[PDB]
Amino acid sequence: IKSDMKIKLRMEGTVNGHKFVIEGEGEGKPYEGTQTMNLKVKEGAPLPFAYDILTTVFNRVFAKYPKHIPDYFKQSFPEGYSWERSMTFEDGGICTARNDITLEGDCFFNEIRFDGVNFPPNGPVMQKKTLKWEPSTEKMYVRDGVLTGDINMALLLEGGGHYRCDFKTTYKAKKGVQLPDYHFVDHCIEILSHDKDYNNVKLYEHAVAHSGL
Amino acid sequence: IKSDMKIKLRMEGTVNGHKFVIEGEGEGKPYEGTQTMNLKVKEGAPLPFAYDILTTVFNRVFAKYPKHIPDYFKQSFPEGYSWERSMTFEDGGICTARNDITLEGDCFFNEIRFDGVNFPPNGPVMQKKTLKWEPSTEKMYVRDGVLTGDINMALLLEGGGHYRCDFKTTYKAKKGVQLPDYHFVDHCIEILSHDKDYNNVKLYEHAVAHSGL
Amino acid sequence: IKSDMKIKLRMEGTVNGHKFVIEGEGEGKPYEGTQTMNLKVKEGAPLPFAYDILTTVFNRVFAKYPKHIPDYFKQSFPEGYSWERSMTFEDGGICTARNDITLEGDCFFNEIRFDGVNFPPNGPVMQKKTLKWEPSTEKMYVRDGVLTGDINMALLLEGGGHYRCDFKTTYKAKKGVQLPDYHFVDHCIEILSHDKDYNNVKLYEHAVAHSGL
Amino acid sequence: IKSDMKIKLRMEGTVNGHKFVIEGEGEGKPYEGTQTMNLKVKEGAPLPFAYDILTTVFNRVFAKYPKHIPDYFKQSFPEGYSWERSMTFEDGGICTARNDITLEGDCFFNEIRFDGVNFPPNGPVMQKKTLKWEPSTEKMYVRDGVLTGDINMALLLEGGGHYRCDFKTTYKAKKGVQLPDYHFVDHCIEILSHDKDYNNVKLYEHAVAHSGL
């Protein structure tokens, strides 16, 4: 894991019955906790739901970990790691997602599956009324020998107000690593640019681990 | 929809990272609320998780509806209907599932996707310690012009005790149908026979709609 | 526990900051699974929230248990039992409640505490837009040597539609009793009459235990 | 609200049927985001449950708010504010709590009610196996004209591992105040000293508001 790394991904999913495929190519700085990616809808264009529900699915290797907190993710390579996540929205929408992350040369490959169910037809996801995710702080703790992260996430909505989602992600190293004590990862994710129907999206994330107050 | 109907299905899914395909062929009696199916694992054998998590995913057409409760499901054909479901287990395991149900001649075809995440590695699902689902009563109510069913489900476990799961299923007719008032559907599902690793399973369900006490 | 029993109760609670006391006197038939009660607001009249949230707090002794299902509740007397319940509404409202049930002569005394928080100010509870609870089926199972009941409950709302609440009640006998296997209790509760601000309410419940389909 | 303020409180509650009263006296620095309190069990000693479940119930006035984030709490006085909270533990334990906060001279008075239900008898709360709350980051957002804070909280347990609780607190000013945009409050709470059965406890909290990464 070098100061500069490339990223490639493929997501296949279904949300509200709508099948899609998205591919991404980007780059990031693992030790600065930053990454940027260009994403293209390859099947199912135009997506009928809020693109924002996908974006946090598009790798905690890209998080700046201070010396005092063991870095579960960077420690996991070359073998790498996978994660699974549930996203429980406050109106009963539920998404499941996974990523199997491999490293070849200077490039992370991401094999992703995303599924979304029970979104109300007049809700902000199906009506595409989301603006952005707010920054967040993920709570990281060991459970059954692997790392779990829980996050209170919120989408800022058109015309004001927020739409809440609770994330639970289970991260699993493919080798033994030094496990961290309870800690936090601050995140900020943003769509830098997109075209009209989000067929093309440029995405960015900054993340930094810390020990709280 | 005749007194006797055939059923065919294909499920593709991933649970705990493990990819699989299962195909099923069966028959049922829509007006008696009964059905039986033979299921075969076509890819991913042997499944590393409790087969029981799948079984309720393997069609509320097969539910005996009395004259006084509009039958959302039978009314929906020939066009048919689809459903989406989240299954929230008490230990944080979450599954998402969907079925798109079509009718050709005397045969229902079921296109199914199933995804499971966040199952604890020492839990009853990953350790295959489930015996059966208990019978249940699904609560059916209209929400946003479509039908929602919520169920408090429980797996009876090896060595006693239960493992709870909450189902929320959204059922969507592909045409206009007379919508029912709040009602119930009693269910009982059972694996009639299986081989050692559940590569072959014979499954049965009985369901009856009612208006409660 | 005779064919006819009297009931007296006192509830103290706070909902949305509003303190109240309600007292009740009634009668029921334990073996027929029926009871009726007259309730009077003694402090905090007029209640600023939907009275319906209280009613299921105003004793599973009054449930008709068939010979084949051990009756945890009737078995518990003369010593009696207590219960605790959480009520999780779909809009984030949460109530907690408890009842300590004693028997003196032919009369059950009920010491009740009820607390409600996080109800949205424009929601159906604070705006008093509830009509009734729908009938329900409670799922009963043993957990840690005591009985747990889970219920998918729904309030029918003014102008149509439902408002969902999930009940979890833990029932604790004050002596050893034969524990039942997994079973169900059907319920129907209804306000028979009330005055304008629900200062006076006549309430009824019918409940019957069964083994499902 | 001065650089130094006094605090007095009274909590009445019931957890697992066990009634108690606790009184507290302390002091804090509202603009430094710190406070300390001495708490005494006045009724129900010795408490049969983990004292830690109470501690975050023992005032966001004591949070350091930077100039760029409107301070909902400090703005609310002299009239003051109240809050309600639900605490949803991962094993089904649920607590409800409220605080009505008044200011007289240099002293905040806190009228508190706390109720806890559905705690498993062999769980860490009833078995008193909690060590401390981990630091946290509360997510603050406006909803229905008032402020809501959600927190992923975790108790560190004896012998390792964590026990998760999700907090939702609704904060209500008793006058009009400038409402803040989405923000965060970092918290750290600690028991500085206690006697054997927690009849006497010295408690401390540090909290700082921020805008995330």
PDB file of C-alpha atoms in Angstrom, chain D residues 1-8 25-31 34-37 59 61-62 74 77-78 102-109:
ATOM      1  CA  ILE D   1     -25.352  31.445  32.023  1.00  0.00           C
ATOM      2  CA  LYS D   2     -21.998  32.290  33.604  1.00  0.00           C
ATOM      3  CA  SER D   3     -18.535  30.801  33.317  1.00  0.00           C
ATOM      4  CA  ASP D   4     -19.267  28.803  36.501  1.00  0.00           C
ATOM      5  CA  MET D   5     -22.646  27.268  37.352  1.00  0.00           C
ATOM      6  CA  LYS D   6     -24.058  24.985  39.997  1.00  0.00           C
ATOM      7  CA  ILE D   7     -26.206  21.958  39.313  1.00  0.00           C
ATOM      8  CA  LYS D   8     -28.801  20.155  41.396  1.00  0.00           C
ATOM      9  CA  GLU D  25     -25.236  18.257  43.349  1.00  0.00           C
ATOM     10  CA  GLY D  26     -22.435  19.577  41.213  1.00  0.00           C
ATOM     11  CA  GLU D  27     -20.862  22.306  39.200  1.00  0.00           C
ATOM     12  CA  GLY D  28     -19.692  22.931  35.720  1.00  0.00           C
ATOM     13  CA  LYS D  29     -18.228  25.319  33.203  1.00  0.00           C
ATOM     14  CA  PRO D  30     -20.833  25.778  30.383  1.00  0.00           C
ATOM     15  CA  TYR D  31     -18.388  27.472  27.966  1.00  0.00           C
ATOM     16  CA  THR D  34     -17.308  20.399  31.462  1.00  0.00           C
ATOM     17  CA  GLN D  35     -19.258  19.389  34.543  1.00  0.00           C
ATOM     18  CA  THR D  36     -18.833  17.266  37.641  1.00  0.00           C
ATOM     19  CA  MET D  37     -21.463  15.990  40.042  1.00  0.00           C
ATOM     20  CA  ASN D  59     -27.612  18.861  30.079  1.00  0.00           C
ATOM     21  CA  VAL D  61     -25.686  23.502  28.154  1.00  0.00           C
ATOM     22  CA  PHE D  62     -22.422  21.928  29.271  1.00  0.00           C
ATOM     23  CA  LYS D  74     -27.496  28.308  25.943  1.00  0.00           C
ATOM     24  CA  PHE D  77     -32.267  30.292  29.049  1.00  0.00           C
ATOM     25  CA  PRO D  78     -33.535  31.841  31.301  1.00  0.00           C
ATOM     26  CA  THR D 102     -34.775  25.069  35.086  1.00  0.00           C
ATOM     27  CA  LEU D 103     -32.413  27.861  36.096  1.00  0.00           C
ATOM     28  CA  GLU D 104     -32.640  29.703  39.418  1.00  0.00           C
ATOM     29  CA  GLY D 105     -29.844  32.183  40.115  1.00  0.00           C
ATOM     30  CA  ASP D 106     -26.598  30.413  39.284  1.00  0.00           C
ATOM     31  CA  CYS D 107     -28.082  26.920  39.597  1.00  0.00           C
ATOM     32  CA  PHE D 108     -29.596  24.501  37.114  1.00  0.00           C
ATOM     33  CA  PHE D 109     -32.279  22.281  38.597  1.00  0.00           C
TER      34      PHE D 109
END
